[PDB]
Each structure stands twice: as C-alpha cells, then as structure tokens.
Amino acid sequence: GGSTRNGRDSEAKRLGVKRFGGESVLAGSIIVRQRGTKFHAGANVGCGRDHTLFAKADGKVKFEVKGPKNRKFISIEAE
Amino acid sequence: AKTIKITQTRSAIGRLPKHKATLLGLGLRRIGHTVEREDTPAIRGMINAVSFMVKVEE
RNA sequence: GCCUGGCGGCCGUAGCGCGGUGGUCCCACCUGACCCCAUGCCGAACUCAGAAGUGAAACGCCGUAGCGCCGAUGGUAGUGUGGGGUCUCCCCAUGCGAGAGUAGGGAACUGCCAGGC
RNA sequence: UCCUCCUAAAGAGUAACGGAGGAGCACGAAGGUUGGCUAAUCCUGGUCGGACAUCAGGAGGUUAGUGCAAUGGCAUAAGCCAGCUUGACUGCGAGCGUGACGGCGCGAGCAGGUGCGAAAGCAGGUCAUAGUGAUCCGGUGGUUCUGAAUGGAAGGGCCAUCGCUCAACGGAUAAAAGGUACUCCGGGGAUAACAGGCUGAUACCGCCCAAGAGUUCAUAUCGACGGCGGUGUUUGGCACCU
RNA sequence: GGUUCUCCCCGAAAGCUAUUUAGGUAGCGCCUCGUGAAUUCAUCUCCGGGGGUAGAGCACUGUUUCGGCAAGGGGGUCAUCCCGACUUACCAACCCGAUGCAAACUGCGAAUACCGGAGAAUGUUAUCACGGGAGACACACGGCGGGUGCUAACGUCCGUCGUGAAGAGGGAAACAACCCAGACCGCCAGCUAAGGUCCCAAAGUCAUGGUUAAGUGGGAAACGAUGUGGGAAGGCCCAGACAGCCAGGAUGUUGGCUUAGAAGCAGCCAUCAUUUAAAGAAAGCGUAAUAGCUCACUGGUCGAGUCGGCCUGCGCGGAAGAUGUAACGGGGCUAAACCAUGCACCGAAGCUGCGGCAGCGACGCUUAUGCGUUGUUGGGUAGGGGAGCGUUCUGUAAGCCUG
RNA sequence: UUUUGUAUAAUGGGUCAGCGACUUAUAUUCUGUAGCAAGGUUAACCGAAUAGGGGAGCCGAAGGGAAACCGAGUCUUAACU
C-alpha cells in the first residue's frame, strides 16, 4: 500500500569461511540472531550481544559437522 | 596413456568467459596451433568441458 | 573375554514395539536424623548417618530384521554448457543429479580412568 | 530521518502505491551476581462461596513467560523468586568487523576503585535490532590558559552545564508568504493534447458447445453458460518519430 | 553550438552514496600517464568449508479438497417419560482414512556458484603502492532468470548473459541489437563457416535414403471428415473376409413382466434350439399396431486382405479489408517440395601459404651490420599518453643569391 | 549538426572569395631541467638600465600541546603500562 519503508541498513552475513585464523584477533563472522544453529568450541566465545566468534587464545578454525542431534560446531585448535 | 592432439572447431568467440578460459588453459590459438596435450584424467576432464568445439586425436 | 560406574566422544546402526536379565560388584529404592546446613512453614528440597528390607520402580545389558533409521543399481524431478525446433515446451549433443521407494545395510562404535569376575 | 522481514536468485547488493509492520523511549528497577525453581491446557475432587474463589493428583508440554515491530534468541534461562548488591564503573587501548564519509559495534592489554561467590568465573547496564538536532550560539559556575604599554578586566580558549519537529530530518543567513488565462525565460515529444504506430481487454461478428425461448421441438429463428477464433477498428492502454 | 594539418600506445560509462537532490557536482566502482619494487590469472580433477535457490514434501504454521466420527459455540425444532432427543447448511477443538497449495511453512534438498588446499597442463608484463589527469552517475536491444500487464503492446519493473553504445566483414529480401566470426595492410593465391548451388545472380536440377499429393511448400486457431503411410493387439480372413451383384428374410412365436398400448418396432427377462439353398423376439424409417419395407444374417459369385478403436507422423476444409499481384524477394515448379547423411562446388576482413608496416622479445647464420628463422600485440569513441609534416617570427641576414 | 542510434520525410548547407577560435597575468605547487645545497633566492632601488650591488622580505632544515609550557622529544597521565 506504499511506500513501503522496508529498511536499508546492514546485511549481517558470513565473512569467516573455510580454514581460518587471526593474527591479533580472530573474529570469524559477525552475524545477528545466530545462537542455536552452530556453536563455539575451544578457545572461542560469544553468545552475548557481540554477534562475533572471538577467541581468548591462539588457534585456527576447521569446522565440525559431528555432535548431538542438531548441534554442529565452529571448532578451534592450536597447531 | 597416449597424449592427445587438439584442434579448435568451432571458434570460442561467441562462448561464455569460463569456456574462453578453458580454450586459453588448453593453450589454443588461431583455431589451431599444433598442440598435443597431457595423458591425464585432469586434462581429459578439461577437454570434456568444451567437447562440442574441441577436436581430439590419439 | 565378561560386568559396571564417571568424564565423555560419536550422537537413530544409538529409535519404537514386545520379551528376556543383574544385586559378589556397583546402582536405586530403603533405614534413620543430633551437629555444620536448610525452610515467607517443613530433613518436602538441599543435607548428613548408614545396612535390617529388595531387585519392583529406578539404573544397565540383550533377543527380535516387523516399522523407523541408513540406502546400491536402474529410472525419475531438476540442472551447467552447446545446436535446433514444432517455443516458458520438445528434440539432439555432452556432463551433473536429488526427493521417495527397492535390494542391501542396520537392533552401533569408542577414548581415558576406576571398581568387580 | 530511524528499525525488521519477504519478493531477492542454495554470498551481499538488487526495481515496482510489489507484499506488510514498527521508532523518535522507558526500567534505579525489569541493572549486577550467587543460590533455588519452571510452564500451557484438560480432566478429577473438596468447607466458609451467590454460578465460579481452595489447590493436590493424574493426562501432558519445552504448544508457558520476556518493553513493543517482524526476525531470531532465551530453561545453562534473559522466565519466576531468595539474599547480597550498584560493574547503569572511571580514564584509556593491540586489533577486528562496517558505511563513501558523518557515525558505530566487537575486543586482547594497563592502573584505580567496587560487588556476587567456596573458588573458578562474571559484572564499564536491561533479550538484540528504532528513542534525535550537528555546525552556528545565548546564558551561567569554575579555570595557577590567555587578553599584546604595565597590572587587573569586558572579550577569546579550556573544563563543567542546557536547548532550535531547524523533522524538507546530512540541518543553504541574529530576519521572509501566496498567485499569474495579463505575464515571461532556457530546455523538450525527454512529456500530454488534434493525426502517425503497437495491442485488441473494450467494441461488433462468427464458430465449438448448449440452461432455455421458439405452445411440439435447444440449435428454422433466437440464446443464459463455458470455450476458440474473425477484424484493425473504433473506446482505452502506451509514450517510440514530431 | 563554432572549436583546426599528420602517424601511433593504453583504453571507459549511463553503476554505488549524498545534494532544494530527478539536466550539475562530490567520496566509492570503471579508464589512463609517470615513478619504485615485482609473474598476473583462470579453466580441469579431487578433498575440505559456509551454504536452502531449483526439485521434493505435509511433519509444524496458515490455507484446502474428499470421505467418515465429532467436544463446544451460533441457528432451528419437539419433548419435558426416559433417561431428554433430531439437525449442523454456519463457527470451531479432538480423531480415523486420503488429497491440493506456500514468497511469507519444512520428520527431505540438487545442478551451478563461491572460498581455500592437494595435483597436472597452457600462455599474455601482469600486481602493488605512490605522484599526475580524467570520462561517466538521463543509453538502447536480443536471449535467459522472475514479478507486473488481459499467462496484451514496438507496454511495465528489476536481476542476468551477450551484442549495438565504441564493431567493420559473410548470412537474415531490405535488418542495430538476431545467425557465422571479432578486421595491422596487400595477393587478377589457396581452404572453410553460417548461408547457398533451375533463372533473375557465382556454384550439384549431385549420390543415396525418408515424407506429403498440393500451387501443399508459399499467413492461420479451436473445430470437423472412410485424406492416408507407419506401430501393437483384437475380430472377420482364403473349404473362402469387408463392399458389390443376384437369390434367400421363419419355426418355436398368439413368449413372459411392467404399463399407457404395442405382433422386434420406447422399458425389463433373456437372446437359444431347429431346418436349409436361407434368417434378429429383433436394426432403422414407419403405423392406431402389424404391414410396408429398406436391412441384420447366410447361400452363390468374385476375390485377398479388411472393420471399429488404440498409438505415432504428414496432409485437407476450418480462412473477409481496404493505392496494385501484395502473407515463398520475383519468375519458373512434380522435385525444379521439405528433410538427413556423404563427397563436391560457391561462400568472411575467419584459417593457410606468399608478400608489406610499427613496438618489444627470441633462435641461428654473418660481420668497416648485414641475412635467414620466428614468438606476439596491433577495430577504437569518452579520456589518458607519445611522436611527425607544414605555416610564421627572431638570429645567421647589409653575409649570400639575383634583374 | 542533433542523438543510444538517422540515407533519413530529424534542424542545416546557392557557390566562389576576404575573414573567424585555448591566451598571458599573478600567486602557489606537481612535473621537467639546472645552479647552489642546510641552505636557496632576491624585490623596489642603486647602477656601467641583458654587468655588479641591494637578502629588506620570503621559502627551508624540530617536533608535541587550545595554550601557559616543554623540546629529540611531547600532549594525554597517578603512571611506570
């Protein structure tokens, strides 16, 4: 019925893909809403607020598909 | 296996950039260049991707 | 080998239905309750002290190929690039290829420690 | 002007008065943290209770709750309570994400001072995404910055304190509204009208077909319903060449 | 709007974001010259990773058909004795058995794409920063992916592939954008593409196979006809079919049921037995009904395929419009129609051979620097950049040339 | 000539001739080129007006901070971090 106002800010979409790390900061993807689809495991934290895959220690991501029922993990391990 | 003699019939001028990149990866020029390509499955899969316009001899 | 407990891993081969099965061991009911502790009231919960009662509920294992679950081969839906046409479809060349079902698979497997035979 | 989802394409962007809803704040608590707990709904059954005030049990569900849009989160609870509590912390900051910038989110690291807890660990605000007004500036308190002859000082700066729906929102100036078929200027079928094209829903007609009319009988003649065309050709659509 | 003589090197856009913004301009995308340091990239295969479109689906949401059961609500009724009962066209919970729809749903989910490894192959001077300039931010079109429109427009709004924008040549009558291919410049040279070879107009009326029967080909729908070849069965079929011609059309039979009557003659039971040269309780027209018949069904005859559908192709009728044939370019037409494969010929600025030109590199021969072999970029508007030839001035120029 | 695009039924042209267009003025800087170099350069004017003087003035070699103030450091700062 016009206009419609629709909004125009942000895309809140993936950035951190494949085998990844972080020299001084590891952040992965910065995405809204996601707290129950894929979970952090190891040196990485989030689930605020924050929307990020921040790491408290040094290591690299490999992604995991194995887990209890619907759970899948964004696993981080040192080299 | 035996290596394969390649010739270009038709030209790629009207074809999509991905296929123009295949003809370039095969090293082909002025629709025929006296080229004979490696006996690998990897090059056979590169010939198969444009087989409607690349000619093959063994 | 076999039996169990914890952390768990894997997470349906780990499910359901129905049956079988254990108390040396561990496990739950069980048997009591000053003190530390707890109750808008309470040994109800949380918590402690233990062995008279039991293998029920609870906990754990297992037979059973009936269904779930996993699903080959063949075909199908769809589709990347190309040639045409009878044109939002069809025909051809050349590749990819589900979803469902079938046959087959499948009533798991396992890392660390500890107790028991 | 701010916020979200879908159309939107197994990254994002991505048009249509395409499809639909919200914001221009509020909570000192609904913040912090430690401990305990968790629905709905139906049925059964019982006084003071007029028809119904009780809660215990089963049947059963993460089909209850949350400041609100829609999206997604949330029981490890952010839901409901019990205590203690004010981290709704200060000045800062490697770095990452992000928009063209304004602006902003995330965050290792340092000191200082608080709070929960056995400790670990968490606390620089609420379940997240909307709650404003810059630049210019008037007024005011402070100021061991400065005021150009020297010493004070109007004044300028620094630091506190507040405000323009300027909302045409990214704001053209302590101060600005309407009308022109009386005009008039630059540009144009980029843009309408009288005509050229395209289309044929509309228009008039036929054919497939037939509820019925035509005292019988659907189809001589005529036709409600549904279908498929004949036409360029009007009423409109449309904005190419003018 | 007027904006200048000659050879070259690289090579855009009509997109993002803002603006008294939709005619301009400014940060990001796209173009370019210099300077310093330098390989820039993709296609193929597999592995791993974030992935929910296409397809699939009904579990959950919302919607929904069909069948059945149906709480409670909304409506109606009769009882108030029968354990109150009938009804659900409406609104709606439960439930048994099925089925449609979905951008806004999911007891499933590709192709492709994108990111990075592990690996092979090929070739472009690239990438990056700094220092200088820009141009554009009103384009148009064919196809594909989707909405919108009347499953209309040379209509509308986007995404997206390629082309016109800035692309010449061969083909589509004439044609921008569609088809073949991307043009450094030549050759009284070859070879092909799309397209084409009876004539207009260069080349097969080619070889061989497939199909229609007509001016189809050469405008055209739903619709309609024993127009008809092919495919798989069925029936009749060669001691004898379909059609034709001639010759045969009853005996049981005055059948039974319903009804308004009905000898086959609108319904129902059935649809056989018998004789022969030979036959329906009935096929059709018809009558008050028989009949009249014309037939069904056999015989003889002739004679080998044929009847109704199913399936798959190609044709016919379906078919009125305006300046003049006027819907294959026009003519011709029995293939001289369409279609497939083969080898020809004609076919481009494509490919090859040979000959010229500019830039930078390479191999070899040869030598007061020449000759062979060659890699390879050369269509360019906006715009960026390099270099030539003329014109004129000052000096040389009171030198030097000359009446 | 206009335009994405015109043989165009889109504006224009009778023809020949004399004509007709990107500069120098100033400041700063980028590039080029050169002299000098932690220095460079002069203006007006003087003067032997294309010499030589004239360095007034300007540009440059040190930064941090509103600024006071400090300086190979300095502002933020209790700070060292």
PDB file of C-alpha atoms (C1' of nucleotides) in Angstrom, chain D residues 6-16 18-19 71-72 100-101 168-172 186-188 190 197-201 205-209 227-233 236-240, chain E residues 16-21 23 27-28 50-53 103-105 110-113 138 145-150 152-160 219-224 318-322 327:
ATOM      1  C1'   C D   6       9.769 -11.382   2.292  1.00  0.00           C
ATOM      2  C1'   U D   7       9.742 -10.577  -3.158  1.00  0.00           C
ATOM      3  C1'   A D   8      15.698 -11.080  -3.783  1.00  0.00           C
ATOM      4  C1'   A D   9      18.179 -15.537  -7.336  1.00  0.00           C
ATOM      5  C1'   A D  10      21.396 -22.809  -2.253  1.00  0.00           C
ATOM      6  C1'   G D  11      27.197 -14.802  -0.618  1.00  0.00           C
ATOM      7  C1'   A D  12      25.741  -9.486  -0.361  1.00  0.00           C
ATOM      8  C1'   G D  13      23.708  -5.738  -3.383  1.00  0.00           C
ATOM      9  C1'   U D  14      19.039  -5.970  -6.233  1.00  0.00           C
ATOM     10  C1'   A D  15      13.017  -2.459  -9.006  1.00  0.00           C
ATOM     11  C1'   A D  16       7.771  -1.985  -8.834  1.00  0.00           C
ATOM     12  C1'   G D  18       5.394  -5.131  -5.290  1.00  0.00           C
ATOM     13  C1'   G D  19       3.854  -7.862  -0.003  1.00  0.00           C
ATOM     14  C1'   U D  71      13.108 -11.756  12.518  1.00  0.00           C
ATOM     15  C1'   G D  72      15.808 -14.837  15.727  1.00  0.00           C
ATOM     16  C1'   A D 100      31.742   6.850   0.538  1.00  0.00           C
ATOM     17  C1'   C D 101      32.022   9.793   4.963  1.00  0.00           C
ATOM     18  C1'   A D 168      12.293  19.413   3.924  1.00  0.00           C
ATOM     19  C1'   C D 169      15.185  15.144   9.438  1.00  0.00           C
ATOM     20  C1'   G D 170      23.041  15.242   6.262  1.00  0.00           C
ATOM     21  C1'   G D 171      20.292  20.906   9.203  1.00  0.00           C
ATOM     22  C1'   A D 172      21.743  26.942   2.318  1.00  0.00           C
ATOM     23  C1'   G D 186      16.004  28.380 -21.116  1.00  0.00           C
ATOM     24  C1'   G D 187      15.042  23.103 -22.459  1.00  0.00           C
ATOM     25  C1'   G D 188      11.879  19.234 -24.839  1.00  0.00           C
ATOM     26  C1'   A D 190      12.930  13.509 -22.685  1.00  0.00           C
ATOM     27  C1'   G D 197       2.460   3.278 -34.978  1.00  0.00           C
ATOM     28  C1'   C D 198       1.943  -1.129 -31.351  1.00  0.00           C
ATOM     29  C1'   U D 199      -2.294  -4.096 -28.775  1.00  0.00           C
ATOM     30  C1'   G D 200      -7.411  -5.674 -29.399  1.00  0.00           C
ATOM     31  C1'   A D 201      -9.153  -6.211 -22.823  1.00  0.00           C
ATOM     32  C1'   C D 205     -19.285 -10.646 -35.534  1.00  0.00           C
ATOM     33  C1'   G D 206     -18.660 -15.990 -36.357  1.00  0.00           C
ATOM     34  C1'   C D 207     -17.582 -20.911 -34.885  1.00  0.00           C
ATOM     35  C1'   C D 208     -17.143 -25.265 -30.969  1.00  0.00           C
ATOM     36  C1'   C D 209     -20.929 -26.024 -27.358  1.00  0.00           C
ATOM     37  C1'   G D 227     -14.723 -22.375 -24.775  1.00  0.00           C
ATOM     38  C1'   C D 228     -11.844 -20.786 -29.622  1.00  0.00           C
ATOM     39  C1'   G D 229     -11.231 -17.533 -33.291  1.00  0.00           C
ATOM     40  C1'   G D 230     -12.723 -13.080 -37.443  1.00  0.00           C
ATOM     41  C1'   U D 231     -11.295  -7.784 -37.625  1.00  0.00           C
ATOM     42  C1'   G D 232      -7.534  -3.321 -37.172  1.00  0.00           C
ATOM     43  C1'   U D 233     -11.216  -0.695 -35.824  1.00  0.00           C
ATOM     44  C1'   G D 236      -8.998   2.717 -23.884  1.00  0.00           C
ATOM     45  C1'   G D 237      -3.916   1.109 -22.872  1.00  0.00           C
ATOM     46  C1'   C D 238       1.229   3.068 -24.477  1.00  0.00           C
ATOM     47  C1'   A D 239       4.924   7.175 -24.579  1.00  0.00           C
ATOM     48  C1'   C D 240       8.512   5.296 -29.950  1.00  0.00           C
TER      49        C D 240
ATOM     50  C1'   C E  16      27.053   2.948  -5.537  1.00  0.00           C
ATOM     51  C1'   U E  17      26.359   7.177  -1.813  1.00  0.00           C
ATOM     52  C1'   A E  18      24.925  12.322  -0.960  1.00  0.00           C
ATOM     53  C1'   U E  19      22.865  17.114  -2.571  1.00  0.00           C
ATOM     54  C1'   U E  20      16.254  22.457  -2.914  1.00  0.00           C
ATOM     55  C1'   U E  21      18.845  16.117  -4.801  1.00  0.00           C
ATOM     56  C1'   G E  23      19.851  18.369 -16.730  1.00  0.00           C
ATOM     57  C1'   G E  27      33.769  10.208  -1.539  1.00  0.00           C
ATOM     58  C1'   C E  28      33.397   4.588  -3.712  1.00  0.00           C
ATOM     59  C1'   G E  50      29.533 -21.552   4.886  1.00  0.00           C
ATOM     60  C1'   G E  51      25.735 -22.966   2.493  1.00  0.00           C
ATOM     61  C1'   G E  52      18.316 -23.752   1.464  1.00  0.00           C
ATOM     62  C1'   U E  53      17.618 -21.465  -4.775  1.00  0.00           C
ATOM     63  C1'   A E 103       7.380 -15.557  -1.137  1.00  0.00           C
ATOM     64  C1'   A E 104       5.702 -15.021   3.906  1.00  0.00           C
ATOM     65  C1'   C E 105       5.868 -23.340   6.074  1.00  0.00           C
ATOM     66  C1'   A E 110      20.357 -30.662  -6.063  1.00  0.00           C
ATOM     67  C1'   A E 111      22.796 -28.538 -10.843  1.00  0.00           C
ATOM     68  C1'   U E 112      25.645 -24.386 -10.620  1.00  0.00           C
ATOM     69  C1'   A E 113      28.254 -20.819  -7.790  1.00  0.00           C
ATOM     70  C1'   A E 138      19.244  10.738 -18.456  1.00  0.00           C
ATOM     71  C1'   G E 145      16.142 -15.792 -14.604  1.00  0.00           C
ATOM     72  C1'   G E 146      11.328 -13.557 -12.201  1.00  0.00           C
ATOM     73  C1'   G E 147       7.485 -10.266 -10.969  1.00  0.00           C
ATOM     74  C1'   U E 148       3.775  -6.683 -13.441  1.00  0.00           C
ATOM     75  C1'   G E 149       0.075  -6.266 -17.622  1.00  0.00           C
ATOM     76  C1'   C E 150      -5.509  -9.155 -20.303  1.00  0.00           C
ATOM     77  C1'   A E 152      -1.758  -7.907 -24.356  1.00  0.00           C
ATOM     78  C1'   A E 153       1.892  -3.835 -26.605  1.00  0.00           C
ATOM     79  C1'   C E 154       7.355  -1.832 -30.537  1.00  0.00           C
ATOM     80  C1'   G E 155       3.759  -1.849 -22.632  1.00  0.00           C
ATOM     81  C1'   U E 156       5.946  -2.006 -17.400  1.00  0.00           C
ATOM     82  C1'   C E 157       9.751  -3.061 -13.298  1.00  0.00           C
ATOM     83  C1'   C E 158      14.240  -5.414 -11.923  1.00  0.00           C
ATOM     84  C1'   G E 159      18.013  -9.200 -11.895  1.00  0.00           C
ATOM     85  C1'   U E 160      21.288 -11.543 -15.568  1.00  0.00           C
ATOM     86  C1'   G E 219      -0.096 -16.353 -43.359  1.00  0.00           C
ATOM     87  C1'   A E 220      -3.610 -19.037 -39.737  1.00  0.00           C
ATOM     88  C1'   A E 221      -6.721 -21.332 -34.286  1.00  0.00           C
ATOM     89  C1'   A E 222     -10.261 -24.074 -31.521  1.00  0.00           C
ATOM     90  C1'   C E 223     -13.200 -27.386 -34.620  1.00  0.00           C
ATOM     91  C1'   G E 224     -14.677 -31.364 -38.254  1.00  0.00           C
ATOM     92  C1'   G E 318     -11.843 -24.611 -40.972  1.00  0.00           C
ATOM     93  C1'   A E 319      -9.646 -18.991 -43.721  1.00  0.00           C
ATOM     94  C1'   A E 320     -13.479 -11.403 -45.348  1.00  0.00           C
ATOM     95  C1'   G E 321     -10.297  -5.432 -45.943  1.00  0.00           C
ATOM     96  C1'   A E 322      -9.044  -1.667 -47.933  1.00  0.00           C
ATOM     97  C1'   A E 327       1.492 -13.295 -46.244  1.00  0.00           C
TER      98        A E 327
END
